């Protein structure tokens, strides 16, 4: 489709470093789909919690297929619809 909507994730985890690795994890997945993802950018950290927001241009169906097929690590949580 025209598409032309773009997605953000936001990742939380008290390890900023298994956070990281999520978000870069994601970041070489994503990317290798026809969509493109902009970041990670990182965030203020709160309760000594990290955060981080991957934002996503022409997202397409093969990236939601490829985060079904692949799981988020224990520690690691995402925000989805706000």
């Given at each position: ?57 022409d997202p397409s169906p093969k ?20």
């Open positions: 489709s025209m598409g032309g909507q773009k997605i953000r994730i936001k990742l939380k985890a008290y390890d900023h470093e298994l956070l990281d690795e999520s978000a870069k994890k994601i970041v070489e997945v994503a990317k290798s789909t026809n969509s493109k993802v902009s970041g990670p950018i990182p965030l203020p950290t709160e309760s000594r919690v990290h955060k981080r927001l991957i934002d996503i241009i990236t939601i297929d490829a985060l079904m097929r692949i799981n988020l690590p224990a520690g690691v949580d995402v925000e989805i619809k706000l």
